[PDB]
Design an enzyme around this catalytic site. Structure first.
Site, PDB file in Angstrom:
ATOM      1  CB  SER B 171      -0.605   0.210   1.141  1.00 24.63           C
ATOM      2  OG  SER B 171      -1.748   1.191   1.693  1.00 24.63           O
ATOM      3  CE1 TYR B 184      -3.901  -2.260   5.130  1.00 26.89           C
ATOM      4  CE2 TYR B 184      -3.368   0.073   4.965  1.00 26.89           C
ATOM      5  CZ  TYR B 184      -3.378  -1.574   4.710  1.00 26.89           C
ATOM      6  OH  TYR B 184      -3.524  -1.506   3.583  1.00 26.89           O
ATOM      7  CE  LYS B 188      -1.340  -3.837   3.661  1.00 28.22           C
ATOM      8  NZ  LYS B 188      -1.287  -4.409   2.890  1.00 28.22           N
TER       9      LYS B 188
HETATM   10  N1  LIG Z   1      -8.716  -1.524  -0.935  1.00 27.73           N
HETATM   11  C1  LIG Z   1      -8.145  -0.380  -0.497  1.00 27.73           C
HETATM   12  O1  LIG Z   1      -8.099   0.825  -0.686  1.00 27.73           O
HETATM   13  C2  LIG Z   1      -6.727  -0.440  -0.597  1.00 27.73           C
HETATM   14  C3  LIG Z   1      -4.964   0.838  -0.232  1.00 27.73           C
HETATM   15  C4  LIG Z   1      -4.299  -0.138  -0.935  1.00 27.73           C
HETATM   16  C5  LIG Z   1      -3.495  -1.659  -0.412  1.00 27.73           C
HETATM   17  N2  LIG Z   1      -4.103  -2.905  -0.005  1.00 27.73           N
HETATM   18  C6  LIG Z   1      -4.217  -4.363   0.158  1.00 27.73           C
HETATM   19  O2  LIG Z   1      -5.043  -4.956  -0.802  1.00 27.73           O
HETATM   20  C7  LIG Z   1      -5.280  -5.788  -0.339  1.00 27.73           C
HETATM   21  C8  LIG Z   1      -6.894  -6.291  -1.360  1.00 27.73           C
HETATM   22  O3  LIG Z   1      -7.544  -5.424  -0.167  1.00 27.73           O
HETATM   23  P1  LIG Z   1      -9.092  -5.611  -1.042  1.00 27.73           P
HETATM   24  O4  LIG Z   1      -9.124  -3.983  -1.006  1.00 27.73           O
HETATM   25  O5  LIG Z   1      -9.002  -5.913  -2.490  1.00 27.73           O
HETATM   26  O6  LIG Z   1      -9.741  -6.080   0.116  1.00 27.73           O
HETATM   27  P2  LIG Z   1     -11.150  -6.534   0.511  1.00 27.73           P
HETATM   28  O7  LIG Z   1     -11.859  -6.391   1.675  1.00 27.73           O
HETATM   29  O8  LIG Z   1     -11.763  -5.850  -1.132  1.00 27.73           O
HETATM   30  O9  LIG Z   1     -11.380  -7.609  -0.561  1.00 27.73           O
HETATM   31  C9  LIG Z   1      -9.237  -8.499   1.167  1.00 27.73           C
HETATM   32  C10 LIG Z   1      -9.909 -10.106   0.675  1.00 27.73           C
HETATM   33  O10 LIG Z   1      -9.290 -10.817   1.077  1.00 27.73           O
HETATM   34  C11 LIG Z   1      -9.697 -12.212   1.719  1.00 27.73           C
HETATM   35  N3  LIG Z   1      -8.581 -12.485   3.991  1.00 27.73           N
HETATM   36  C12 LIG Z   1      -9.115 -12.218   4.406  1.00 27.73           C
HETATM   37  N4  LIG Z   1      -8.535 -12.420   5.528  1.00 27.73           N
HETATM   38  C13 LIG Z   1      -7.979 -12.975   4.835  1.00 27.73           C
HETATM   39  C14 LIG Z   1      -6.857 -14.861   5.036  1.00 27.73           C
HETATM   40  N5  LIG Z   1      -6.804 -14.955   6.902  1.00 27.73           N
HETATM   41  N6  LIG Z   1      -7.169 -15.480   4.694  1.00 27.73           N
HETATM   42  C15 LIG Z   1      -6.775 -15.552   3.017  1.00 27.73           C
HETATM   43  N7  LIG Z   1      -7.858 -14.377   2.526  1.00 27.73           N
HETATM   44  C16 LIG Z   1      -8.277 -13.093   3.335  1.00 27.73           C
HETATM   45  C17 LIG Z   1     -11.399 -11.783   2.237  1.00 27.73           C
HETATM   46  O11 LIG Z   1     -11.822 -12.426   2.316  1.00 27.73           O
HETATM   47  C18 LIG Z   1     -11.160 -10.389   1.062  1.00 27.73           C
HETATM   48  O12 LIG Z   1     -11.604 -11.734   0.107  1.00 27.73           O
HETATM   49  C19 LIG Z   1      -4.575  -5.985   0.510  1.00 27.73           C
HETATM   50  O13 LIG Z   1      -3.837  -6.357   1.528  1.00 27.73           O
HETATM   51  C20 LIG Z   1      -4.852  -4.141   1.362  1.00 27.73           C
HETATM   52  O14 LIG Z   1      -4.540  -4.310   2.420  1.00 27.73           O
HETATM   53  C21 LIG Z   1      -5.905  -1.731   0.123  1.00 27.73           C
END
Ligand SMILES: NC(=O)c1ccc[n+]([C@@H]2O[C@H](COP(=O)([O-])OP(=O)(O)OC[C@H]3O[C@@H](n4cnc5c(N)ncnc54)[C@H](O)[C@@H]3O)[C@@H](O)[C@H]2O)c1
Ligand SMILES: NC(=O)c1ccc[n+]([C@@H]2O[C@H](COP(=O)([O-])OP(=O)(O)OC[C@H]3O[C@@H](n4cnc5c(N)ncnc54)[C@H](O)[C@@H]3O)[C@@H](O)[C@H]2O)c1
Ligand SMILES: O=C(NC[C@]1(O)CC[C@H](COc2ccccc2F)CC1)c1ccc(O)c(F)c1
Lengths: 285, 294
Positions: B171, B184, B188
């Site tokens: 991130s 968080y 990260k």
């Molecule tokens: N969404 C944002 O704004 C954002 C910003 C930058 C980085 N990220 C990062 O991107 C990644 C994905 O986020 P997203 O926005 O797609 O989230 P999301 O909520 O859309 O999906 C995340 C998925 O991960 C799964 N997950 C959670 N805990 C888990 C576990 N213990 N084992 C297996 N699967 C698990 C959930 O079931 C879900 O399907 C994360 O690492 C997040 O930190 C997200």
């Protein structure tokens, strides 16, 4: 590689001289830490032990924590010789329950900590596939997770009085990386991230009285790791790092690199894509 | 703040145009990923789901992992519609034992993974004193510790064949920080540190065939964080982030920022005169639901 080796020596000499020049022309104000209750983790040896000696000379009330009982009693005896009042506790700083119980004891026997130095650290040098999973967990439990538990326990009082100083002992491994130290570098990056996010959250909440400092030294001769062949970075002595830390704390410096000229290697990394990275990597091997 | 806003707008318009100029003058070679075995963690929703769709279009064999069986099977149905062969497994990617057992199953039913996308993540927005210790541990277990266990399980085969690609989804919180996200941001930063140290260790060992990529997006509209608002960065759409990731992977890009111009905000931070940090902080006005005191 002869030209880049000598060029970097001169850049190092220019920075070191210009820093000492600015330290006289525009000196930074030094606060007092006399009578403050200072908790130092990993105080039974190395950076924590010599940082305790600096705080003893500063007339602070010390609370020393370590798993090494003999070690922390040796530090405490010297701090007492320096005129300081010292309290020692045997605490595993990677165990959440041990930390909380020990904070209850520190409140009952000493009072409310005003300066927290999260110094305790652990390292198991090895390539990723030669590491033990227990060692990776241990590295995170002590190097970052313990920082959360201690800070959470001691922050409420500091916020109530709008007065405190949280010191995070990270490493240059929290800014840059070294092979054979993947789990360690990852936890040190985590430590820098915690310092930076804690600093920003205190400003956002309007908490002006709680200061933060992050100590990032290169290799220090403490026995923490086996000696290397690092030609560019110096093999620091423990007392030097503890002096740099106390100077940074008293001056409210947020990021303390030891040696301070390490910041040029960091600035060169953000402007170096990518064939010049390997050239300076081999000048230190 | 009118003057500094136009100064930041000009630095964003110039970067976006100069990037498209370098993309034509010095185009980067795009490798093929057809027939590669790609494991995507957290593939039941958001970035992981749409990254799986990009790899399905690329003709790879997919291995989707998630705690949500309903969601991961729904992503697999769409990947199959796209012509891809997909295998799903219900794996807690923050559990070391569950990971190792599941890797034994992936080897027996699919084969050796060649591209690992460590995407699964969690977040519990709240100020430091309002966090739960269980949430802090959970954040580290999924966001970084799980990256160690999966990488350790899948790396031996990649080293044996001198062929692989480890993608770590971190991130912009692994480079910069946001209040109410201390645990968080810390996790990260650890993910970025792991990517950088893994990259350097592979070079030091002489392993030339294993590539690494680190995806660092700003807020993405996936529901992961509640009501994200950024006055200078856009609120990204999921498909856009998955497109940026697939482009970066095919091009062996080590650090993928979304949007790519975020690198200017990072360069400005290392040359920050302290008083100019707060001016852009109030012009950015970052909003999102978090536990501040209550
Ligand atoms: N969404 C944002 O704004 C954002 C910003 C930058 C980085 N990220 C990062 O991107 C990644 C994905 O986020 P997203 O926005 O797609 O989230 P999301 O909520 O859309 O999906 C995340 C998925 O991960 C799964 N997950 C959670 N805990 C888990 C576990 N213990 N084992 C297996 N699967 C698990 C959930 O079931 C879900 O399907 C994360 O690492 C997040 O930190 C997200
Ligand atoms: N030594 C270096 O080269 C170097 C480089 C930069 C950063 N650092 C960091 O500085 C800090 C101190 O390192 P050092 O060189 O002084 O090490 P050291 O070996 O001299 O002393 C470390 C101390 O921490 C204690 N400790 C370890 N695990 C503990 C635990 N679970 N609970 C409580 N105490 C514990 C040890 O018993 C020991 O007394 C660490 O955080 C380390 O990562 C060290
Ligand atoms: O210098 C620190 N340790 C030094 C070692 O003990 C010895 C060298 C190896 C790295 O080895 C190589 C690097 C590049 C090429 C070839 C190598 F063999 C790391 C461990 C060290 C330890 C904690 C720190 O926080 C830190 F900043 C530095």
């Amino acid at each position: 590689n002869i030209i880049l080796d000598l060029l970097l020596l001169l850049l190092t000499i220019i920075y070191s001289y210009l820093e000492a020049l600015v330290k006289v022309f525009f000196p930074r104000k030094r606060k007092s830490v006399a009578g403050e209750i200072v908790l130092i983790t990993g105080a039974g040896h190395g950076i924590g032990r010599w940082t305790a000696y600096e705080f003893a000379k500063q007339k602070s009330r010390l609370v020393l924590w370590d798993i090494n009982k003999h070690g922390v009693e040796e530090t405490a005896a010297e701090c007492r010789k320096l005129g300081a009042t010292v309290h020692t506790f045997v605490v595993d700083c990677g165990n959440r329950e041990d930390i909380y119980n020990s904070v209850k004891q520190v409140k009952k026997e000493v009072g409310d900590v005003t300066i927290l130095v999260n110094n305790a650290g652990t390292v198991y040098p090895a390539d990723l596939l030669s590491t033990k999973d227990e060692e990776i967990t241990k590295t995170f439990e002590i190097n970052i997770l313990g920082h959360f538990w201690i800070t959470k326990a001691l922050l409420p009082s500091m916020i109530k009085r709008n007065h405190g100083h949280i010191v995070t002992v990270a490493s240059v491994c929290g800014h840059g990386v070294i092979p054979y130290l993947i789990p360690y570098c990852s936890s040190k990056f985590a430590a820098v991230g915690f310092h930076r996010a804690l600093t920003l959250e205190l400003q956002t909440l309007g908490i002006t009285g709680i200061k933060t400092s992050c100590l990032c030294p290169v290799f220090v001769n403490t026995g923490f790791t086996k000696n290397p062949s690092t030609r560019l970075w110096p093999i620091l002595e423990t007392d030097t790092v503890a002096r740099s830390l106390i100077d940074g704390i008293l001056t409210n410096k947020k990021m303390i690199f030891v040696p301070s000229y390490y910041n040029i290697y960091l600035i060169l990394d953000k402007f170096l894509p990518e064939r010049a990275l390997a050239a300076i990597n081999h000048l230190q091997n």
